Design a binder for these strands. Sequence first.
DNA 1: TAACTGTACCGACC
DNA 2: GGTCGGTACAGTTA
DNA 3: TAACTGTACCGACC
DNA 4: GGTCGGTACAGTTA
Lengths: 172, 171, 171, 172
Amino acid sequence: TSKKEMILRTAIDYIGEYSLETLSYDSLAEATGLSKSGLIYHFPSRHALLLGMHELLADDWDKELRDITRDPEDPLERLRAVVVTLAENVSRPELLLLIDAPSHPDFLNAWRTVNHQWIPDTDDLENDAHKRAVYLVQLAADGLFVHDYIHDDVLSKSKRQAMLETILELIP
Amino acid sequence: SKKEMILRTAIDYIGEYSLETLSYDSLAEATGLSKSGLIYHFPSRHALLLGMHELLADDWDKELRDITRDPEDPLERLRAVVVTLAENVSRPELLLLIDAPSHPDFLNAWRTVNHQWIPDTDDLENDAHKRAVYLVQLAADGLFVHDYIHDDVLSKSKRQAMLETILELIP
Amino acid sequence: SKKEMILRTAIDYIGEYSLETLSYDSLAEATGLSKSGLIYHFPSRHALLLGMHELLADDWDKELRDITRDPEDPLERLRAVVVTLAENVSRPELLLLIDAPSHPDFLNAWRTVNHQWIPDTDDLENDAHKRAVYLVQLAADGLFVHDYIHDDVLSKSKRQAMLETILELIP
Amino acid sequence: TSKKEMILRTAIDYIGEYSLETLSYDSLAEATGLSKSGLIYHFPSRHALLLGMHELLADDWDKELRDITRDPEDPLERLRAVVVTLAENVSRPELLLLIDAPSHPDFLNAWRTVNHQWIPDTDDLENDAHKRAVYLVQLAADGLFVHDYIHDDVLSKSKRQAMLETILELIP
DNA sequence: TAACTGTACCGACC
DNA sequence: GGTCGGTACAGTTA
DNA sequence: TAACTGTACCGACC
DNA sequence: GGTCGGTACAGTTA
């Protein structure tokens, strides 16, 4: 009967719709049906509530990346899954959370797996043309991830598939 | 003008912290003015935010005009877009671009820029060359946002190199 | 109930000062509670003011039940109106009655007393009896407001003599 | 010229229609089309603006009282004017000021004429029938002055005259 | 017995 | 003239 | 030399 | 996230 995960989904859904500044116990109570004491029961500070949201979303993204990877040892094969989940499996909440995370080490740490085991390493890229060609993909996937929140002019699915394919065809 | 100075301080303030802790009070510190003198200049919070959207939107239209010496070709515009995104737009611009949907006034302030300098998505599905330019656009947005969504700041050396590689890609 | 002790302190504050300077902070000083403890109990200012109106309008109704010994007739209600106006109603009720038009909720809290106890102003051009009762109502009202609009508080004895004079005048 | 009496009149009219707590430099600037600076020139503080208003209205009244007293030796004649100018020639502003007056020595003092040279005397009426029947009249007049602001039942012009006549008939 | 809900407060801040 | 993030603890429902 | 207007700024309170 | 009561001038209009 523990509604601890349901609260987080509700909180994530809420920040997509509205935003972080406006997420508070009262407004999460209103949205969960729960009472404020109820929420405090699982998340005794706002800091825990946010941690849980970061953790929850980083774990969605890790599970998503590992599932769609055909072979986990092939670098290019995992870069392809980074490109794909960035174009389809991450939305507004993740972006707001990525941006909020630097604001506390706890939140940074919650994202360490998926920023250190899936995003390609920046090493001597000044003078390595292949490595820099692998980073160009990463940069382009990141632009397709944030595109609809920064351009005010959403891509339709069809345009987004077309651009996803273009970022893929560019994998070495 | 005292107005532009206050707005400049508010922009650095949000780069360092966020919109949500931008308050008349926290802004009175950073600017040295009293909470009340601040309100004299920006009589509501919405005005203060409208100021900041407008200042940044304008600065962006400025720098990308002082950088293209041929406004004609979508390609020279496109060059201007990549460089400004790569090297002279930071965290505050990203913060206000995210926040902009929350009021029509905010959207309206970026309207000039967001459609005038931004390549056209229009028929992208069938035009390979139009997908080659949007790929550049996307890579630029990638470098613009890079350090604020991966816990890893690029060094100036790395950043310059990725700018070039993107600059290469240009049709 | 803690609500009722809070209203009671607010009633005495406005007796000493005014409604205009009655604020959550100034009522927190006077009650011992914190600003937000008070807001827990009355969540908006409207609610606090509605509470004070309700409380006085209802004490006056009660104080005018254990005094009138035959709710039946116009005259025994009038005697009661006169006595309560003369001696168990002071500056807070005057202040609240002046403020009460500022909102329908407040007027409404004074319905029971304002018509059901106070004699009617109806049919008063032509009925001598009805003018002799309203004369008594005006005098009672005059004694009620006396200390607060004339720079001269009456003593208890002066007040009883006058009370008694209005009471004689009863048709 | 000098807008000074004109500002006070506007301020009086303002609070009649609205009230005292809302009367401010800003709101009085709007009502007068003057500037806050303009108002502060005549009235260096709000205190000085309320006194102006207390002073002005007590003189309108004192003027009105002696304007309508035929024989000012006669204690019953002045009692008649009191009643008359109470039932006919004072309105809301006048009530709000009276009620506010005791909150400051200057305000009390500005009402000293009309309260001393005109209001009959509470002097051993405990044992004196005539004196107390003179107070009764004063008492009913005060009641007709406050009626409309205390009872939520504005009297018609006609009923107000009817009641005024009745208090007057109660005279010597 | 864990998962709540309600009630009464309060300091920093908007 | 409030909100917001707590804190404290008693009383109820799966 | 008086009666304003506008512009910037602030502490206490709401 | 503000209003209310100023303070402090410099310039303007009769």
